[PDB]
Design a protein around this ligand. Structure first.
Ligand SMILES: [Mn+2]
Ligand SMILES: [Zn+2]
Ligand SMILES: [Zn+2]
Lengths: 359, 716, 324, 166, 48, 48
């Protein structure tokens, strides 16, 4: 349980059951004069609420100024002020990537609305699937604000610069929600998806090579097939307008046009230009090579020392090469949950190695 | 040890480790010179003969990862050392070729400013502005396209006209075309252990049907994001030049294009309203799609607003982007020491107030960071974070100036600080006008703060009265015998600051919440050093609450001398720091900070630009090989050790290259002893703003501090 | 033209003093730009009156303030009310033979193997050296002499040491230390009046044995003249008082006006100083206090022409019409 | 480095120099000699002419599939004619048919589209943010219960700090 | 010629003492030799 | 006055390699000649 003071007599209690940096489920209670009441419960991640820890006056000032930006019409800011404040509040109480994507889509919408011509596939890049029924309210608030500022028949653009600035600053509210990868495994999986999808769609993703510069007949066959498919686009067929590839005719045209000093650039250059981690794991705090080197060095030092008996001071060695009870605690406190788990794993390895050496 | 471990795990509450130890205990786990000469020390894998797909030393292996962004995560490719060197050579060649070019703006701020002003003029005049963002620039390009391009080019020499042979470049590109990208082991385990997914379907189809579990993926079109950036930039530049030529020849318009290797901006001037240009732009889109330059649906064409590198220009002015800077200021609280956090927040608030945000919001951010550093258990210090109750004078003012402003605001009726400013002005006049002072102030300052201040005073002029009066104001400096020892949440596997800044100049995934939590936790152990280590509250509990009408003007900030008799090791005068700051501002940005502050006698929407009004007297150019000579002269042992092992140009720094600068001699010794001035690392840097948008309501409420001539107009 | 250096420095000093009271220390003399008097190696001519403090600064003095009125010679014409006191022998053996006299006869018999050891003389000579101007000073000197006791004739000497103290100016202590080294005392006839008198005070006794056996010193002639400053010579019951201030070009020792030294400005200099000042009220005070100082000077050379129309920029008719 | 703890760290380089001189003087293949000299120097970019670049019967098809249409010597006027013909074909084959990629705004249609995509109408959620989000309901409850309504404790906190420290 | 050289030396002396802006650059200009050092001092004073 | 420990500092400043070699092997008082004992004389810099 944690405590926070709110008034002269009543305090607030925060009850939970787990430790670490994972997402937990919390329960909030109050206490006025000893009678412990019930306020509620929720489920959230603690490392996504660092912004409002003390920014209770900065947000008020910035929203007050953003609302006073629209002081050109007495009656328009009175309707957008509370709406803006409620939208900001709902954004702070619900951090998610979908909200950021929605506000970026709103920014692009405003950018396309200000100008005169826009792409025909615009409205399909603004929709985002909402879940947990929490994005509905923020999307409705943003849409209502955009409509209240943009709608109108004739007297809807009395001061369009102020309106554009306000809407842009509203769409840019996505920077308030932090970007700290809500889940690592899902993000890595999605990255692998986005990486390997176009290559499977094209049809040229080969399987594990020899890693030495020796390809089989099928590998080189499919490589040459992909190379041919890359340079097999014509200048008249309108069917291939979204698949990768280039036509050789236009390339030859551009080359012959650039060679004979026709473009704004030419080949008249000066100053002649001719003057241990593992790759299969990026993001891990410790690779297998480093763990193995550490355990080998530690067991070697312990074998050299036995020239038996060994106290827990060997654990101190683990703390010395990775980053006397006081120094031990000071070097042990600086580890994270995954770090302390890896340290316990290394400790287990070193201890079982010493035990098997003892036999 | 096995039985000891089992017993120690059994006596505790957890039984899982007990079961693991119980299981591992139960034993439940049961004469040619080309072949016999490459096993001792022969570097057999050295590149001597290569093929069109490898180099006899690997196949340019890579590694896949992601990078965090606001909207969606970006790709990331990290390579081995050999492929890193090859990519470095390729990118150096391509960046040289691009620097030889003009229109591209990726590593040239001059062309960026040119594009900015051209876009502004076009928006003010009403030309056709088209911002083209392209979708899937990375995962679509292929090294074969660059290969064909470089095969088709000539690259004529400037004075030889020799048609340089791009043989090695084509060889390295052929090597890159057959690169091997290794998949992460986490995705492999997640798909092996075990909703519809196409890549998961491909993984399960290539799991054991054709071969083994996929771990290495080679293909034609990869072009790893952040690998071939310069080559892609140059290719896009030439393609856009060809396209603008074609448009100029077909639709008799005047196009000018600026590129950034990911997005472009085209300014089109039409002859002789804008409803008859749809065919032109769709033909341009078709021609770009004929190349590998597919345009994204987010690209916009109009005549009212333009965008380039997230910099929106509209008719008349520019959008300030308030909330972006506000969120950037509230975020990225990376604290190793309170001083570096204060400096980071200083830079951020400066670049924020540069874009006409406000003067009442920055005060709130400064109060916020003050409360953050106070909550950590450090207590408020005279310098601390950014001062409160600032003004629009962030222009023509550096960190030293605002620190001086804070120290001046500490005192209500400045008589001690005014006297110190007068003494600093006297020293400045006698060192510049009288011009007889050098390297003796170096001998007088190296001692410390107390004797140096009274020495400067008796050089100017004083008595024992001033010695016992000025030197009474003391503040607690916890980092007096060194720096605060602490181990924060860093990554695994692992002297004044001016030396470190110079070493950084010569040479070439963690969360903010957890970082601040570790900061507050490590600021509670034995941190302050002496002689041994102890607590901060232990030091702050030894002060005596005398309350003698002089240590009460600002509690927990300023004390008297006898109030620190119990703990006197951490007690330094603040007037010495004020003197140092005044002299440092004098050597930095002129002598207009010696006068007294006078106070003066608009719809919140009248914005306008202002320029700094600084005047330097410190040899304005101030390049390298000047601080190095001064350090070699003044601090020989400090110039030999900890400095210049990684240097081969000592001859020019030794042969008196404009030796004995006007003020770099004395304006450098105050920086090495004081741990919070930081001016030598600031003089070797640009303003980075050069212009400040501000509202008129803040310009009329500023303080008028312009100094008359100290000689009272009496000199000549 | 160092004469111009001197007169411009004096003008700056007087016009800077006539805006607010300042102390007459090195803080208000070295802190001025026109103090080029430390330069100009040929220092035969000083500004108007500050010879003594300039000669002191050439030795890098740390003085603050005193009655610098050398016009009335403080080093010459000084009262010479000189005297002496008894002695106190070191290597204490007299406390055992002082009280048993209650006599002097056994002490005289003891003073009559041979036991002539070293002799320690301690003197505290206090004088009241005055000066020509209205002032006073009390200066006492401690003298410790290590000599050799004699058999019968006079005495034998080895070494001497002096330590001045008390309240007195530089010229006062200079006169005192010069006359104590050139007096009818030990150096010469020694003017020594033994008469078994100071022994009767040290060795407590009220009897005489009809034998004085007068002694005389033959001191070497050491020269302890190394202070020459306002310093009270490392000891004194009175320190750091009598501060000199300046309000209207007149020396104020405690509030009384001593005199005003003449300073010329020729009109252009005063406006050249009035050009860049702190604020409006400072110029008001300066221009209101100028003509009261003009009453103590004689300078009409200030050109009444276009320069006066330039001074007219500071519209202060009340200040120029108040003195009338 | 070839340093060790048995020699004075000055003979190893001499032996290495003597050995490479003896090797370059007389030998006894082609690449086994270039690596032996390279693996005994101390320190040593582009211009990799020391390489061999041997063919493997595979780069043939690479060059045959990569450099057949690359000429780079086309005249200037024929390109003009080809672009003119391509534009004349584009104008009346794919643009007059309605297969473009861009269109005018018609701001009313954009407003309708945003109201359709953003403002949800087929959802069962109510128009109140407090009863939808749990954290908003919690903060509302706390604020509306708070707004509308001694040496013992310090000794206790001190002993709490002492036991937490020990 | 020697009177002109004495005048140049007097000018260097005045600018190094009265003007008081000269140090360690004459060291860099003199270490070369006699010819270039003399013409450098001359063009510092003034000549053709 | 012009005593010792002034030419030595000037040589150390102007000619470092000439101050290390051929000079000061037979010296144990380098600390006072290094801690700027009245450094930058009026003319000993250029008159040397
Ligand atoms: Mn863009
Ligand atoms: Zn106090
Ligand atoms: Zn509700």
């Amino acid at each position: 349980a944690q405590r926070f003071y709110l008034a002269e007599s009543l305090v607030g209690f925060l009850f939970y059951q787990k430790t670490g940096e994972r997402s937990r489920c919390y329960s909030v209670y109050l206490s006025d004069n000893g009678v412990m009441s019930e306020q509620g419960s929720f489920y959230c991640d603690p490392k996504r609420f660092f912004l409002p820890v003390f920014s209770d006056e900065v947000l008020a000032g910035m929203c007050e100024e953003m609302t006073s930006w629209l002081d050109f019409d007495t009656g328009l800011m009175n309707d957008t002020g509370p709406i803006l404040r409620l939208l900001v509040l709902a954004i702070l109480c619900s951090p998610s990537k979908r909200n950021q994507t929605f506000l970026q889509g709103l920014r692009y919408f405003l950018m396309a609305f200000a100008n005169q011509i826009h792409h025909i596939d615009l409205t399909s890049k603004l929709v985002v699937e909402c879940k947990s029924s929490s994005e509905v309210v923020v999307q409705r608030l943003a849409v209502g604000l955009f409509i209240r500022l943009l709608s109108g028949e004739s007297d809807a653009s009395l001061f369009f610069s102020r309106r554009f600035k306000y809407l842009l600053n509203v769409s840019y509210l996505c920077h308030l929600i932090t970007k700290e990868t809500p889940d690592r495994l899902t993000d890595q999986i999605k990255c692998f998806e986005k990486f390997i999808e176009p290559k499977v769609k094209f049809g040229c993703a080969v399987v594990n090579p020899s890693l030495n510069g020796k390809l089989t007949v099928d590998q080189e066959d499919i490589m040459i097939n992909g190379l041919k498919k890359f340079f097999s686009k014509s200048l008249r067929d309108t069917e291939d307008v979204q698949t990768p590839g280039v036509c050789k005719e236009l390339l030859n045209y551009c080359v012959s046009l650039f060679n004979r000093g026709k473009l704004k650039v030419s080949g008249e250059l000066k100053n002649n230009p001719f003057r241990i981690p593992k790759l299969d794991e990026l993001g891990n705090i410790l690779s297998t090579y480093d763990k193995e080197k550490l355990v080998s060095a530690c067991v070697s030092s312990m074998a050299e020392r036995f020239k038996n008996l060994d106290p827990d001071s060997t654990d101190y060695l683990i703390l010395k090469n990775l980053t006397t009870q006081e120094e031990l605690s000071l070097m042990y406190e600086a580890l994270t949950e995954e770090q302390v788990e890896s340290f316990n794993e290394i400790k287990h390895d070193v201890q079982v190695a010493l035990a098997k050496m003892a036999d | 040890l096995l039985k000891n471990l089992t017993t120690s795990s059994y006596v505790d509450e957890e039984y899982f480790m007990c079961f693991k130890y119980l299981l591992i205990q139960g034993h439940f786990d049961q004469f040619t010179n080309a072949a016999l000469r490459n096993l001792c020390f022969y570097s057999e894998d050295s590149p001597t003969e290569f093929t069109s797909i490898s180099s006899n030393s690997g196949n340019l292996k890579f590694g896949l990862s992601y990078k965090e962004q606001v909207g969606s995560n970006r790709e990331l490719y990290v390579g081995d050392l050999n492929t890193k060197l090859m990519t470095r050579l390729v990118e150096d060649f391509s960046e040289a070729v691009g620097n030889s070019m003009k229109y591209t703006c990726l590593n040239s701020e001059k062309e960026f400013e040119r594009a900015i002003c051209d876009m502004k003029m076009a928006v003010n005049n009403g030309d056709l502005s088209c911002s083209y963002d392209h979708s899937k620039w990375g995962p679509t390009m292929s090294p074969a396209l660059f290969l064909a391009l470089l095969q088709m080019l000539e690259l004529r020499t400037p004075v030889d006209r020799s048609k340089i042979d791009l043989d090695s470049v084509k060889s390295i590109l052929k090597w890159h075309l057959h690169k091997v990208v290794e998949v992460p082991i986490n995705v492999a385990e997640a798909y092996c252990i075990g909703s519809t997914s196409l890549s998961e379907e491909f993984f399960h189809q290539t799991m054991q049907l054709n071969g083994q579990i996929p771990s290495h993926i080679m293909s034609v079109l990869d072009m790893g994001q952040g690998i071939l950036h310069n080559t892609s930039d140059l290719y896009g530049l030439i393609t856009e030049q060809f396209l603008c030529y074609a448009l100029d020849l077909l639709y008799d318009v005047i196009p000018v294009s600026y590129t950034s290797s990911d997005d472009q901006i085209t300014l089109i001037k039409t002859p002789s309203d804008a409803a008859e240009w749809l065919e032109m732009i769709c033909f341009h889109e078709f021609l770009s799609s004929k190349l590998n330059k597919f345009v994204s649906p987010k690209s916009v064409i109009g005549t009212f607003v333009a965008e380039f590198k997230s910099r929106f220009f509209v008719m008349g002015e520019e959008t300030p982007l308030l909330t972006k800077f506000v969120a950037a200021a509230l975020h990225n609280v990376k604290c190793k020491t309170p001083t570096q956090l204060s400096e980071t927040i200083d830079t951020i608030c400066d670049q924020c107030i540069a874009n006409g945000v406000s003067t009442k919001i920055v005060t709130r951010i400064s109060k916020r960071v003050n409360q953050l550093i106070r909550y950590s258990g450090y207590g408020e210090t005279p310098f601390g974070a950014i001062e409160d109750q600032d003004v629009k004078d962030w222009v023509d003012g550096s960190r030293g100036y605002r620190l001086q402003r804070k120290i001046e605001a500490i005192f209500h009726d400045d008589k001690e600080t005014s006297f110190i400013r007068n003494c600093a002005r006297k020293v400045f006049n006698d060192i510049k006008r009288g011009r007889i002072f050098e390297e003796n102030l170096i001998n007088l300052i190296g001692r410390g703060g107390d004797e140096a201040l009274t020495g400067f005073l008796q050089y100017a002029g004083c008595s024992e009265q001033e010695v016992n009066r000025v030197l009474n104001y003391r503040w607690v400096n916890l980092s007096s015998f060194g720096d605060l020892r602490l181990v924060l949440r860093t990554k695994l596997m692992t002297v004044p600051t001016l030396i470190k800044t110079l070493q950084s100049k010569l040479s070439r995934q963690s969360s903010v919440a957890s970082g601040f939590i570790g900061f507050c936790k490590s600021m509670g152990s034995k941190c302050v050093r002496d002689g041994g280590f102890l607590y901060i509250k232990e030091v702050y509990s030894g002060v005596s609450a005398c309350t003698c009408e002089i240590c009460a003007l600002k509690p927990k900030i300023i004390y008297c001398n006898n109030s620190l008799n119990k703990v006197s090791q951490f007690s330094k005068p603040i007037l010495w720091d004020y003197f140092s700051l005044v002299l440092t501002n004098a050597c930095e940005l002129g002598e207009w900070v010696f006068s007294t502050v006078k106070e003066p006698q608009n719809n919140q929407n009248f914005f306008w630009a202002v320029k700094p009004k600084v005047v330097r007297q410190i040899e304005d150019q101030l390049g390298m090989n000047h601080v190095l000579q001064s350090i070699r002269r003044n601090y020989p042992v400090l110039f030999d050790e900890h400095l210049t092992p990684f240097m081969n140009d000592l001859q020019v720094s030794r042969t008196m290259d404009s030796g004995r600068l006007k003020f770099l001699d004395v304006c450098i010794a105050l920086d090495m002893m004081n741990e919070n001035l930081g001016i030598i690392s600031h003089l070797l840097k640009t303003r980075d703003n050069s212009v400040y948008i501000v509202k008129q309501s803040d310009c009329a409420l500023a303080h008028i501090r312009q100094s008359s001539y100290t000689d009272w107009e009496l000199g000549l | 033209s160092p004469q111009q250096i001197c007169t411009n420095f004096k003008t700056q000093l007087v016009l800077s003093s006539m805006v607010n009271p300042l102390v007459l220390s090195t803080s208000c003399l070295k802190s001025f730009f026109w103090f080029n008097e430390v330069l100009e190696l040929e220092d035969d001519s000083q500004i108007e009156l500050a010879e003594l403090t300039d000669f002191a600064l050439m030795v890098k003095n740390q003085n603050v303030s005193r009655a610098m009125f050398v016009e009335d010679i403080a080093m010459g014409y000084v009262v010479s009310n000189f005297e002496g006191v008894r002695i106190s022998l070191s290597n204490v053996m007299v406390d055992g033979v002082q009280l048993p006299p209650q006599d002097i006869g056994e002490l005289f018999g003891l003073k009559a193997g041979l036991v002539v050891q070293i002799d320690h003389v301690r003197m505290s000579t206090k004088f009241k050296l005055k000066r020509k101007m209205v002032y006073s000073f009390s200066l006492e000197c401690i003298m410790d002499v290590g000599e050799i006791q004699n058999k019968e004739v006079i005495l034998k000497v080895v070494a001497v040491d002096q330590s001045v103290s008390g309240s007195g100016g530089n010229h006062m202590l200079l006169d005192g230390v010069s006359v104590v080294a050139s007096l009818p005392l030990f150096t010469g006839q020694a003017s020594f009046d033994l008469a078994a008198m100071l022994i009767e005070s040290n060795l407590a006794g009220s009897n005489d044995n009809f034998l004085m056996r007068n002694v005389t010193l033959d001191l070497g002639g050491f020269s302890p003249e190394l202070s020459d400053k306002y310093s009270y010579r490392l000891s004194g019951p009175e320190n750091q008082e009598d501060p000199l201030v300046l309000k209207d070009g007149a020396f104020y020792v405690g509030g009384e006006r001593l005199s005003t030294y003449k300073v010329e400005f020729t009109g252009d200099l005063v406006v050249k100083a009035l050009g860049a000042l702190e604020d409006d009220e400072s110029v008001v005070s300066m221009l209101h206090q100028l003509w009261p100082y003009l009453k103590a000077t004689s300078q009409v050379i200030l050109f009444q022409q276009e320069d006066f129309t330039i001074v007219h920029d500071l519209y202060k008719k009340q200040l120029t019409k108040s003195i009338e | 480095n070839y340093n060790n703890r048995f020699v004075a760290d000055w003979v190893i380089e001499r032996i290495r120099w003597l050995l490479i001189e003896i090797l370059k003087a007389s030998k006894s293949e082609d690449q086994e000699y270039q690596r032996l000299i390279h693996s005994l120097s101390n320190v040593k970019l582009e211009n990799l002419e020391h390489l061999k670049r041997n063919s493997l019967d595979y780069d043939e098809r690479l060059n045959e599939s990569l450099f057949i249409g690359l000429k780079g010597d086309i005249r200037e006027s024929t390109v003009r004619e080809e672009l003119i013909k391509l534009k004349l074909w584009f104008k009346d084959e794919v643009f007059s048919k309605g297969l473009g990629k861009f269109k005018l705004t018609d701001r009313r249609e954009l407003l309708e589209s945003l109201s359709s995509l953003g403002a949800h109408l087929d959802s069962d959620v109510s128009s109140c943010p407090f009863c939808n989000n749990k954290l908003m309901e919690i903060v509302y409850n706390v604020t509306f219960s708070c707004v509308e309504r001694s040496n013992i404790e310090k000794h206790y906190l001190s002993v709490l700090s002492l036991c937490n420290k020990i």
